């Protein structure tokens, strides 16, 4: 292809080799000297008090140094919530009191000298409770409903427009509790020394980890160092630490020793939140041609008794189609459950699912082909924001996706397509994800050997940040990007925001592109300003940077390693970034240390778009469902690395397959326990579940969206997939399944 | 209270005296400082801990280090040659982008080496079925099929 | 885990002699034993490794008896060149179970003795009412979420389903379990009598004394075993236990089903031989609808609980379709 492999090339992952040989070290694989081992204790009841707790049989076992509970406590300060400008998704503080607000809640930690000793002794702690009546489900009596009013959509007049609508579709769509379940469990090493703490925390946002851990411990933010160069994925579950890290930190400060604390895989279900269960009552008014003149939505989602988090089902509702009258209101239902957390495309995923199933029902009510219906509702602008699209290729996504899938041969009648003992079904859905932006900084260093190192605190969670930041710098440095080393995921590195909302590739490529331009200018200037340089007097305009050397167009040349020898080490380090050049440093800290300063374009509505086409095979006797074909056409704008972009695309789609077919949280109504908490009873897609996947790139560079021209990728692949699978199952069977997942019991 | 055993790990002897409760998975990770083998579940439901014992792919989280006494263990760190060229499976995994976060990848790769030796590489669907004992939450399955199809071809020569 | 003491047995008889002592447990593959130790339902003070007992590793297929020792792995049995041709249902009950990694670890002896996947059984730190685990404490699944629990062979004390696939194929085809005591003598147990109904004593699963160890299994080699299938229905496509499953086989002699064998996995407290569906199809030519309607006879002994009603619909259909798949071979 092209030798430097700059931005836009499709190259192998720069971190790929250390990952395939097992060299890359994740959080707990680091080696402090003589570390202890903590094991967390979790409540077995949903609501009540801890009436009796006896740890003596645990303290007496082999190697047990301490057991910290509310009876033997350690101060943990209530952190500042994300919505208030803080780093905390959950404000729960363990071992500060005896109150039980949900089942599986972290109530303590047992510290021992070996992991085996800590596991055994934790099982010897005896806990009795005084239970109070628990609110298990969002629909239970006495559950408080808090409306999220600032997120209400009041657009046009929906009540008037719905009353006059010729065709009305009114149905409820639900999604169950879902769990990110990254293959790396939440675990950390907390090392407290001399008024400072270093924590090895798997993180998508290391500045966020630094803020919340400092608040927990009651120390200055600068006193915390977070080391997270490699993460085993969070899919939204590791932007900010959770309380097992709080227990690990205070224990390490009390014992003045390093403590390795791993949540067990079952404990990761209640040690943090997944996607909360949602419910949406969605009404579509439309004229008989299929054109929708009104949408009314009333939705809700679960949240704990402590924190208010919304999984908002209105995120896509007014964005996707041309509808001038939209009323949507979402409320949270406070119940006894762990504080919810992000999961891939928060609020966008359940919003698109209900909307894109409702379109399919509207299409079968009017006997319009579902694709044809999406075109009759096409929105030439954003009707929610009343703004023109920056770029939207959705039409080309429909067409290129339909072509590759063979959608033109679809027989509309459900159950019409069959092969052998399998009912065939075909379904489709629109998808989207918004473009967010945040400033960020980076540093580039020329080593004494003539090599480049790129430094940024941004995270590579498997997204490819290691690779695209090396491609960006290579464009201006005259070397191949595979020779450029990138250091990431550490609070000692230059400022970077969250990896969340699928914004970080654009934010960091912009920051490195500026730093690399500044590095080019520095090197050429050094070659011309350093009197010992063979280029000592020559103009910079006639210099080029090529193949690890600076060469004058007159033919003389200087190698990068030779320039390093002639230059002062401090001049070989260049800083750049997208913050305003005049912004004071304290505000640059604050911006990347919270989530509320992200921006979107004014005057343009900038989003990624997609068209999802699915073929399912339903067994006529058993009701089991298999995904035979997946064809997706996606507009992500400019692709920084087309190969890593496809991996993101198909990654999100596979997660959407688990969402539709299998993934469900199972809660026992008596005790409010999640009894399927394990990878055996909580099913995620297995290699045999996924067929060959076709992805088509319809996107074009959008510079009204991001400085570097890309749009959202990481979360785009999941959006709308579950609806398309449900639409396909209906087409095979004739049964609308509006609650997820679609399991065999719901088919027959 | 303790037991003694010797283990062949990637061609080198490793005498150990340990708590008998220590799994092979945690003997590699916590003791021998070989962290390439991963713990994603510890109950045998995922496969991030997949290693080779006497040439066969197993789950090291359900194997006691005691059961590995006098056995040949091959972890992810031992697939490179003595000079350390990548195994064909390791190189095809990078070229085909068969991983993203990398956490399931060592178990994915060790399971694919044994999958090939077992003769289960005959077709795309056969690979899918006999690789299904390794969960990937990143969704790299389609590229895992590519990497294994290509590596099985190279190895047949 | 509990701080067990590790002991290695050098003979089957010394393993039986050590097993008999007060809560000791055999360790073979570990894929059940070690998992349930981490769950907290197993706390043996003495763990007896039996791998490295070479006497139990024999395997051969014959014209009369398929014979394998208890330490034969699932993979070795399934990969034997005659397994797929001579015993498709046995072969299908193998590769459709667990994962290749687990099948390489899993011995045939431990496979039969695997334990229910009941979620309340496997979390004793949370739920203390399990009669199988903890006699007299109740059953947490009766009023809980029983989606995984039994529609056949259930009692008030335990509704747990026996998850294993292999035993289902063996029970259909009349395998025999051979066990041995510390003095070296041998008991031969027909496999349908080897697995016990829970009744009031769900803690007694198998007909095995603390005295005894499983040393070998044998299956009658029959044309009914030659024409057979194991059909497994599950939520995802691999690496999961059956929502319902049936091992089925028959010999076609004079264009007619004879020696019809049918057993139901995943729906019952123990692998369930459907004898009346068999009798209804004996002396009958293989045909679509007569197989389907005869299979529905299982619905006269079936009892649905709150959340498992889908298993009632699946049971006759996995019986029928397993038979249909068998009649396509030779
Ligand atoms: C994630 C997962 C998925 C699974 N899916 C399936 C599936 O789909 N289908 C399926 O059929 N199985 C499945 N299994 C279970 C697996 O097949 C069994 O765990 C395995 O067969 C047990 O054999 P083992 O050698 O590991 O026995 P062990 O785990 O070593 O022992 C099991 C029990 O049997 C006893 N035992 C062992 N050997 C003897 C002997 N010689 N005499 C007397 N008692 C003995 C032990 O004391 C122990 O109590 C699954 C397991 C896991 C972890
Ligand atoms: N125009 C673009 C934009 C992105 N990319 C590619 O897509 C990746 C992600 O870009 P972006 O959309 O900015 O995603 P973020 O890094 O901001 O965040 C990742 C996103 O998508 C994810 N991808 C994940 N991948 C892995 N392996 N593991 C996780 O936990 C992941 N979690 C997530 C979740 S959730 C989110 S929010 C980049 O590294 C790049 O390789 C591209 O090629 N071209
Ligand atoms: S069903 Fe059997 S195992 Fe499950 S809880 Fe009730 S008794 Fe214990
Ligand atoms: O925004 Mo991704 O972390 S749910
Ligand atoms: S860690 Fe062994 S299978 Fe999950
Ligand atoms: S690479 Fe992240 S889980 Fe497979």
Automatic annotation (TrEMBL), chain A:
Keywords: Molybdenum, Oxidoreductase. The keyword Protein transport does not apply. SMART domains: Ald_Xan_dh_C (SM01008). Pfam families: Ald_Xan_dh_C (PF01315), MoCoBD_1 (PF02738), MoCoBD_2 (PF20256). InterPro entries: Ald_Oxase/Xan_DH_a/b, Ald_Oxase/Xan_DH_a/b_sf, Ald_Oxase/xanthine_DH-like, AldOxase/xan_DH_MoCoBD1, AldOxase/xan_DH_MoCoBD2, AldOxase/xan_DH_Mopterin-bd_sf. One of its GO terms (molecular function) is iron ion binding. Residues 21-133 form the Aldehyde oxidase/xanthine dehydrogenase a/b hammerhead domain. This is Aldehyde oxidase large subunit. It comes from Methylobacillus sp. KY4400.
Automatic annotation (TrEMBL), chain B:
Pfam families: Fer2, Fer2_2. It comes from Methylobacillus sp. KY4400. One of its GO terms (molecular function) is metal ion binding. This is Aldehyde oxidase small subunit. [2Fe-2S] cluster 2 binds at residues 100-102, 104, 136-138. InterPro entries: 2Fe-2S-bd, 2Fe-2S-bd_dom_sf, 2Fe-2S_ferredoxin-like_sf, 2Fe-2S_ferredoxin-type, 2Fe2S_fd_BS, Aldehyde_Oxdr_Iron-Sulfur, Beta-grasp_dom_sf. It comes from the Bacteria. Its cofactor is [2Fe-2S] cluster. Keywords: 2Fe-2S, Iron, Iron-sulfur, Metal-binding, Oxidoreductase. [2Fe-2S] cluster 1 binds at residues 40-41, 46, 49, 61. Residues 3-79 form the 2Fe-2S ferredoxin-type domain. The gene is aoms. Signal peptide: none annotated. The lineage of its organism: Bacteria, Pseudomonadati, Pseudomonadota, Betaproteobacteria, Nitrosomonadales.
TrEMBL record, chain C:
[4Fe-4S] cluster binds at residues 118, 130, 139, 158. FAD binds at residues 26, 28-33, 98, 107, 111, 114-115, 165, 214, 232. The keyword Metal-binding applies. It comes from the Bacteria. The keyword Glycoprotein does not apply. GO terms for molecular function: 4 iron, 4 sulfur cluster binding; FAD binding; metal ion binding; oxidoreductase activity. Pfam families: CO_deh_flav_C, FAD_binding_5. Transmembrane segments: none annotated. Residues 1-224 form the FAD-binding PCMH-type domain. Keywords: 4Fe-4S, FAD, Flavoprotein, Iron, Iron-sulfur, Metal-binding, Nucleotide-binding. InterPro entries: CO_DH_flav_C, CO_DH_flav_C_dom_sf, Diverse_Substr_Oxidored, FAD-bd_PCMH, FAD-bd_PCMH-like_sf, FAD-bd_PCMH_sub1, FAD-bd_PCMH_sub2, Mopterin_DH_FAD-bd. PANTHER family: XANTHINE DEHYDROGENASE FAD-BINDING SUBUNIT XDHB-RELATED (PTHR42659:SF9), XANTHINE DEHYDROGENASE SUBUNIT C-RELATED (PTHR42659). This is Aldehyde oxidase medium subunit.
């Amino acid at each position: 292809g092209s030798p430097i492999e700059g931005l836009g090339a499709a190259r192998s992952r720069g971190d790929g080799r250390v990952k395939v040989i097992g060299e890359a070290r994740y959080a707990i694989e680091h080696q402090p000297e003589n570390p202890l081992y903590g094991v967390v204790l979790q409540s077995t009841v949903a609501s009540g008090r801890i009436s009796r707790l006896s740890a003596e049989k645990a303290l007496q076992a082999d190697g047990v140094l301490a057991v910290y509970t509310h009876l033997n406590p350690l101060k943990i300060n209530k952190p500042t919530a994300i919505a208030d400008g803080g780093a905390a998704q959950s404000t729960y503080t363990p071992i500060q009191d005896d109150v039980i607000i949900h089942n599986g809640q972290n109530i303590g930690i047992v510290i021992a000298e070996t992991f085996e000793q800590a596991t055994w002794a934790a099982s010897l702690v005896e806990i009795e409770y005084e239970t109070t009546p628990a609110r298990v489900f969002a629909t239970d009596e006495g559950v408080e409903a808090k409306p999220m009013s600032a997120q209400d959509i009041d657009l046009g007049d929906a009540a008037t427009a719905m009353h006059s609508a010729e065709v009305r579709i009114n149905q409820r769509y639900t999604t169950p509790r879902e769990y990110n379940m990254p293959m790396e469990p939440h675990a950390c090493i907390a090392h407290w020394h001399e008024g400072q703490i270093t924590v090895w925390e798997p993180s998508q946002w290391v500045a966020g980890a630094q803020v919340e851990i400092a608040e927990w411990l009651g120390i200055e933010t600068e006193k915390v160092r977070i080391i997270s160069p490699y993460v085993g994925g969070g899919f939204g579950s590791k932007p900010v630490p959770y309380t097992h890290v709080a227990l690990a930190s205070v224990a390490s400060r009390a014992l003045n020793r390093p403590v390795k604390v791993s949540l067990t895989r079952p404990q990761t279900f209640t040690g943090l939140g997944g996607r909360p269960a949602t419910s949406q009552q969605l009404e579509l008014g439309a004229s008989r041609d299929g054109k929708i003149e009104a949408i009314i939505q009333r939705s809700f989602s679960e949240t704990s008794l402590i924190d208010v988090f919304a999984e908002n089902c209105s995120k896509v509702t007014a964005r996707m189609y041309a509808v001038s009258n939209v009323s949507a209101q979402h409320q949270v239902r406070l119940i006894n459950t762990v504080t919810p957390g992000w999961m891939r495309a928060p609020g966008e995923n359940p919003s698109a699912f209900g909307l894109e199933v409702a379109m399919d029902e509207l299409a079968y009510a009017l006997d319009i082909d579902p694709l044809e219906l999406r075109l009759r509702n096409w929105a030439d602008k954003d009707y929610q924001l009343d703004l023109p699209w920056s770029t939207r290729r959705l039409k080309e996504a429909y067409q290129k996706g339909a072509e590759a899938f063979g959608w033109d041969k679809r027989i509309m009648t459900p159950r019409s397509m069959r092969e052998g003992r399998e009912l065939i079904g075909w379904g489709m859905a629109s998808g989207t994800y918004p473009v967010n932006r945040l400033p960020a900084e980076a540093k580039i260093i020329l080593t004494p050997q003539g090599r480049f190192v790129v430094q940024c605190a941004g995270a590579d969670i498997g997204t490819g940040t290691y690779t695209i930041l090396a491609q960006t710098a290579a464009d201006h440095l005259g070397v191949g990007s595979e020779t450029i080393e990138v250091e990431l995921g550490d609070t000692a590195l230059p400022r970077a925001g969250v990896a969340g909302g699928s914004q970080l590739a654009g934010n960091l490529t912009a920051a490195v592109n500026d730093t690399a331009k500044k590095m080019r200018e520095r090197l050429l200037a050094l070659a011309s300003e350093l009197p010992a340089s063979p280029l000592s007097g020559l103009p910079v305009s006639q210099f080029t940077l090529q193949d690890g050397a600076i060469q004058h167009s007159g033919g003389s040349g200087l190698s990068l390693a030779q320039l390093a020898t002639l230059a002062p080490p401090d001049s070989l380090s260049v800083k750049g970034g997208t913050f305003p050049d005049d912004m004071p440093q304290s505000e640059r800290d604050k911006i990347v240390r919270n989530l509320n300063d992200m921006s979107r374009p004014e005057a343009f509505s900038a989003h990624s778009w997609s068209a999802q086409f699915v073929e399912v095979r339903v067994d006529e006797d058993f009701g089991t469902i298999r995904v035979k074909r997946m064809v997706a056409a996606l507009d992500s704008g400019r692709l920084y690395n087309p190969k890593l972009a496809r991996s993101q695309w198909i990654g999100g789609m596979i997660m959407g397959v688990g969402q539709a077919l299998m993934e469900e949280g199972i809660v026992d109504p008596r005790n409010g326990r999640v009894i399927n908490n394990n990878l055996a009873d909580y099913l995620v897609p297995v290699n045999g579940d996924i067929p060959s996947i076709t992805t088509i790139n319809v996107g074009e560079p959008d510079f009204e969206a991001t400085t570097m021209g890309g749009k959202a990728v990481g979360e785009l692949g999941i959006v709308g997939v579950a609806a398309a699978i449900s639409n396909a199952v209906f087409h095979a069977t004739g049964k609308r399944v509006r609650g997820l997942p679609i399991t065999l019991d719901k088919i027959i | 209270e303790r037991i003694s055993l010797t283990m062949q790990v990637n061609g080198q002897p490793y005498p150990m005296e340990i708590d008998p409760r220590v799994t092979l998975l945690d003997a590699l990770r916590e003791h021998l400082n070989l962290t390439g083998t991963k713990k994603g579940c510890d109950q045998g439901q995922c496969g991030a801990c997949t290693v080779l014992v006497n040439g066969q792919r197993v789950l090291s989280c359900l194997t006691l280090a005691a059961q590995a006494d006098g056995a040949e263990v091959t972890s992810i760190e031992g697939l490179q040659s003595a000079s350390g060229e990548l195994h064909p499976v390791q190189r095809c995994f990078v070229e085909n982008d068969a991983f993203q976060c990398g956490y399931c990848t060592p178990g994915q790769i060790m399971s694919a080496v044994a999958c090939i030796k077992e003769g289960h590489a005959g077709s795309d669907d056969e690979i899918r079925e006999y690789m299904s004992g390794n969960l990937c939450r990143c969704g790299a399955y389609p590229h895992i099929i590519d990497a294994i199809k290509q590596a099985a071809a190279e190895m047949a020569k | 885990m509990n701080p067990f003491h590790w002991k290695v047995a050098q003979s089957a008889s010394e393993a039986a002699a050590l097993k008999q002592q007060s809560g000791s447990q055999i360790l073979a593959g570990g894929t059940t034993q070690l998992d349930l130790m981490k769950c907290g339902v197993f706390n043996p003070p003495q763990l007896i490794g039996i791998n490295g007992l070479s006497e139990l590793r024999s395997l051969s297929f014959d014209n009369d008896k398929i014979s394998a020792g208890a330490l034969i792995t699932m993979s070795q049995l399934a990969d034997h060149p005659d397994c797929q041709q001579h015993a498709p249902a046995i072969y299908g009950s193998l590769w459709q179970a667990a994962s290749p990694q687990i099948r390489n670890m899993a011995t045939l002896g431990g496979n039969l003795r695997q334990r229910t996947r009941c979620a309340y059984y496997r979390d004793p730190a949370t739920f203390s009412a399990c009669n199988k685990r903890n006699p007299g404490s109740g059953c947490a699944a009766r009023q809980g979420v029983n989606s995984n629990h039994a529609i056949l062979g259930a009692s008030d004390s335990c509704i747990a389903v026996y998850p294993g696939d292999l035993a289902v194929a063996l029970v259909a085809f009349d395998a025999v379990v051979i066990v041995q005591n510390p003095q070296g003598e041998t008991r031969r147990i027909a496999i349908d009598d080897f697995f016990l109904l829970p009744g009031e004593t769900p803690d007694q699963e198998h007909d095995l004394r603390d005295d005894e160890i499983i040393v070998a299994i044998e299956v009658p080699q029959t044309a009914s075993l030659q024409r057979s299938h194991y059909l497994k229905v599950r939520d995802r496509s691999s690496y999961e236990f059956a929502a319902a499953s049936a091992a089925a086989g028959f010999t076609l002699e004079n264009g007619v089903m004879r020696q019809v064998h049918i057993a139901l996995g995943g729906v019952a407290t123990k692998p369930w031989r459907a004898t009346r569906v068999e009798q209804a199809l004996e002396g009958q030519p293989f045909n679509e609808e007569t197989v389907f309607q005869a299979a529905e006879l299982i619905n006269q002994e079936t009892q649905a609980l709150e959340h498992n009603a889908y298993k009632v619909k699946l049971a006759p259909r996995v019986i029928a379709r397993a038979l249909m798949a068998a009649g396509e071979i030779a």
